[PDB]
Amino acid sequence: MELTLGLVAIASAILIAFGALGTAIGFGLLGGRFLEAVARQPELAPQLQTRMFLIAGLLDAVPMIGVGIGLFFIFANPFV
Amino acid sequence: ELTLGLVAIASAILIAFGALGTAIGFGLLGGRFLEAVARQPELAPQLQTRMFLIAGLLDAVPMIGVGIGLFFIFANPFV
């Protein structure tokens, strides 16, 4: 019982942690190349920004979905 | 009792690792996409089609992990 609760806490922690680790590097990788692109073609800022936001929305899905189940486990968990 | 916690750990791994993979793959793809579009702006739609073909081919296996994880969470074997 006690061990079950501890393992639930651990699993929930991993769910948040790996998602944060993924997104924090993905956004950096995207933004660096974005800055290079906008620097080379300064007049194309708005369409480049739109393409960016499309990418970013398409990017963060799986990890930050896992974040949701993590919070689910935090507060309303099965197995009890 | 221990089996429940272990299944919880396994499920967490299932979503988390695929998530970590996708979060990096999409960034790596999008960076080159942004460089490509800025260099040949009039070719944007073709590049977008190629890119979404790539994304559809890519995100498959992490979805497979997510599905098995969700299956574990609600209706799991080993009970």
Next chain:
Amino acid sequence: ELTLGLVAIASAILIAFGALGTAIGFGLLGGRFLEAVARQPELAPQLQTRMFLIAGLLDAVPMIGVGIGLFFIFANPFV
């Protein structure tokens, strides 16, 4: 009893590591693919052909691992 949980962990690892590998692989492959096709917009078809060839060559071991994982899920040994 613990055998069930450990088998669950093993199955989770099998799927997770393969997904993590494939997501990175296709991402960094597609980035280079988009960079290349931008250079030579006319040369798209055989580029896609080579890319699909190597992609099919790529997923071999991850697919092998996924099958073993599902085998563990449904009808595992050690029971």
Next chain:
Amino acid sequence: MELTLGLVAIASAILIAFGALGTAIGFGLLGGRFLEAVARQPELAPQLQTRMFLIAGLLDAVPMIGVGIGLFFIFANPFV
């Protein structure tokens, strides 16, 4: 109970640790490209700086979220 306390402490530590690890790499990856870009077009410093702040705000969301759950665990923890 004791084991639960230890395990939740571990989970809390993981929550902050992975977020810090992710954000440290992300900011470096963004900033290197930023510094390269500003040198190539020194006139465009303000707008590029604004875009960099936009990316930075978009980036560290999830790690900052995880910091919240970490502080929650350290101070007001469930499972007690």
Next chain:
Amino acid sequence: MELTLGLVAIASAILIAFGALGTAIGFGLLGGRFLEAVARQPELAPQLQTRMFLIAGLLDAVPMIGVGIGLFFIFANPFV
């Protein structure tokens, strides 16, 4: 005896998993530069493709061996 079974299962999973992770990274890393090479000089496509196959056949050797040991643990395992 149960612990032995579980640990054998874990070891088997590790054997295939790490090899798959390595192969997936290596194949893509090779393929990106392969695409650049073939796109820059499309005339040399068969020769370059042959060289890439040579490299690949030299690549997956150790992971392929590891998969065999993993499956060996699966079907006919020692230590029993």
Next chain:
Amino acid sequence: ELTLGLVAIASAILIAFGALGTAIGFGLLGGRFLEAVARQPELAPQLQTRMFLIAGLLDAVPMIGVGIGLFFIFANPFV
């Protein structure tokens, strides 16, 4: 008793991951920084000031974690 060791190892992880992140991040930043200043030596002060700005922006979360680790060290909960 077993609590105390877990507290110690958690505190160690807190500092360790932050240090690992900062070491790689500062190297990644400084690489481009040095590469940039050599290209355009006349811009050294402005680029250096920007580097201080972004460096201060960088190490925030690791420094936050260090304080939590130290709090675990000296006067911790769970007692």
Next chain:
Amino acid sequence: MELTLGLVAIASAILIAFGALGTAIGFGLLGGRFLEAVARQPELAPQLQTRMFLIAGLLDAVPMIGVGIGLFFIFANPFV
């Protein structure tokens, strides 16, 4: 002694797994630049291939050693 057998299996798995993981990434990283070099200088293929064999044989030495220790544990291990 059961846990000893299990941990021996785990260790043997790790030995082969990490070696395969390293070799797979290393060969791909090498072959990418190799393909760029062979494309840019098509007249230079043989001596570059010779260099690549030299450095490849120089590469997988330690992972091959680790495979040996893994097999050692598999067939006849100490600690019995």
Next chain:
Amino acid sequence: ELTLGLVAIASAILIAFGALGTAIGFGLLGGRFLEAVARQPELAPQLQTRMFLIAGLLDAVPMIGVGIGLFFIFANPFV
């Protein structure tokens, strides 16, 4: 008893992660530094000074963790 082993593990983690971070960071810095000084040999001393500035800024947090590790080694709490 077990607490002592856990403290040992934590101390090892502290030192090991710091060493791993520093080794990668300094290499990443040095690659770009050598490339830059190769491009512009005249400006070697100023770039060298910029090195030590950024490197002293870099190695801080791992050095902080080293002290904590040594503290756990010699005079540890939790006893």
Next chain:
Amino acid sequence: MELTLGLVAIASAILIAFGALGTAIGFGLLGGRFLEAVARQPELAPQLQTRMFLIAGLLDAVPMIGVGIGLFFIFANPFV
């Protein structure tokens, strides 16, 4: 005491595993640039080839130190 034997086995396996993984990545990272350079300047092949062994001998120092202790644990282990 059996537990100690298993743990020492794990530690020894880690010793070789991490060293092999590091060396495999390092040699590939070096060889890529080496091949690209020899493509750029085929005239200076012997000099570059000398430098590459110089640094390679400078490279594997720490991993070879670890492999020695790893082999030391296998046969003549302390703690017994």
Next chain:
Amino acid sequence: MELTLGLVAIASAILIAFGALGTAIGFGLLGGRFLEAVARQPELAPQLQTRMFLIAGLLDAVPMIGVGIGLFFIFANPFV
């Protein structure tokens, strides 16, 4: 005390393990650019080797320190 001995052994192993892992990648990353630079400016080879020695000596300090702690654990350890 047995479990304490095993954990101390694990700690001692991982100490030098991570150090080797770091050094192997670091030297490779440095040497790649070193060879490329010396190819670009073949006249500066002694000066480049001086700078490379300086930075290499500055690099491996922390892993070498960790090796010392590891050896201390191996021969004359606390926790007895």
Next chain:
Amino acid sequence: ATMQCDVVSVKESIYSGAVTMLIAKGAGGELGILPGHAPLVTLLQPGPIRVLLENGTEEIVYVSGGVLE
């Protein structure tokens, strides 16, 4: 050592001789040139060129746009 440097305009040759070093501003940025350099070609910003003789005397030539080889 020394290497043959020729600075020629569209009308006539301006400077010539053997020099030990050259400094110019390429499209990417400043460039240092020493004998045995790998082949390279850029476009020069409208700035002066500095060449260092073996004796230590340094001639300077003003160039407004052009190609460096």
Next chain:
Amino acid sequence: KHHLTNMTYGKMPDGTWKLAETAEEAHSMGFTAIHLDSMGWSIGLGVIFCLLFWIVARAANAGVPTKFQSAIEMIIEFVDSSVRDTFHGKSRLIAPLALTIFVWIFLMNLMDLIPVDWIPQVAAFVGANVFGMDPHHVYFKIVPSTDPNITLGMSLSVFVLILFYSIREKGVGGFVGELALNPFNPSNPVAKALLIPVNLILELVTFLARPISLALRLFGNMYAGELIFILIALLPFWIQWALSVPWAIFHILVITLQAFIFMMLTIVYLSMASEKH
């Protein structure tokens, strides 16, 4: 406080007030497939959207636009421009459904800016006058529609439309036939592992996961944001709530981004289903 805080975290995440036929309102324990009282409040927010657009729609005039109709003109022209320049080939009310879903999800997400407890605690008044206090204190009130069922029903309709345009190829067999990531694996035991399981996994993953991904991505945003807001509410005495204002500014930033991403990817998927041959 601590007991009160735990009770509150029991309260706010109560699913749709969980009404039930052949039963009372709720007992926080039913957990059956029964009535839901949240998306009714969501429709109460969609209706003002339709009315606001109908206001301009009935007023058909080409004169100088006033501020409100100028802004609505911005919105309609922007969504039309996006749909047009990005996507083409054929048009059956695609841009209308796109503009509806965009604004509808945006307004749903917008409601989060209100405080965590102001509406439920003002609802203590209607608890006092009718239905008592304790029934309000078990589970009675709901927050903006952040529950996963809303977004799941939302996404599955898009999936149905994907099916409807995916049968436009005039044959189920023609559409089902598609290119596979796994055309071949020569090895024989590998073929055993490949034939049934891997291909079944492929046909599962190819299309089915995507609407789930959409629904869960939106759900994560909503639920994480709201839980952050509840968690902030502690230790009020000596503070300026600096943990809230910048965070809610970022929340304002992410709201429009999420709505935009949902709309854009939906039109993407419809365009893909509309691919020729």
Next chain:
Amino acid sequence: INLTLIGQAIAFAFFVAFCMKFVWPPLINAISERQRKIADGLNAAEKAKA
């Protein structure tokens, strides 16, 4: 959370309504700007007539 299929049922139903039922007043709206462009092109042609 909980499935509670009632929520998703009402969501789909009211979505299909609130969208198809009021696609039409939007379809009205596309024309005004387009005809404004008509006006602003014809007033461009008038000077050529001059």
Next chain:
Amino acid sequence: NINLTLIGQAIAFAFFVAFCMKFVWPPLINAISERQRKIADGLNAAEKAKA
């Protein structure tokens, strides 16, 4: 307690509206006004054009 907590949240919306004006209102208002200006100029040109 409960009301005292809501007192801080009163400060919240105060600062939200304060920052909403200074930052968000000028750009939207300027966009509206400018698009109105170009529409008005385009129609007035047509008016003198018909004359």
Next chain:
Amino acid sequence: AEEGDDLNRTYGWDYIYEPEAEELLNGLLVRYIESMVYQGVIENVACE
């Protein structure tokens, strides 16, 4: 213009183009055409 040169005697080295080769080629071509025009004017002066 005598493009047959440097095909049999060409070596296995290329430059290190600081800009992309396309822009460099355009910049070379413009200046080359201008120089052709100039040295065609000078010959006309001598003929005059």
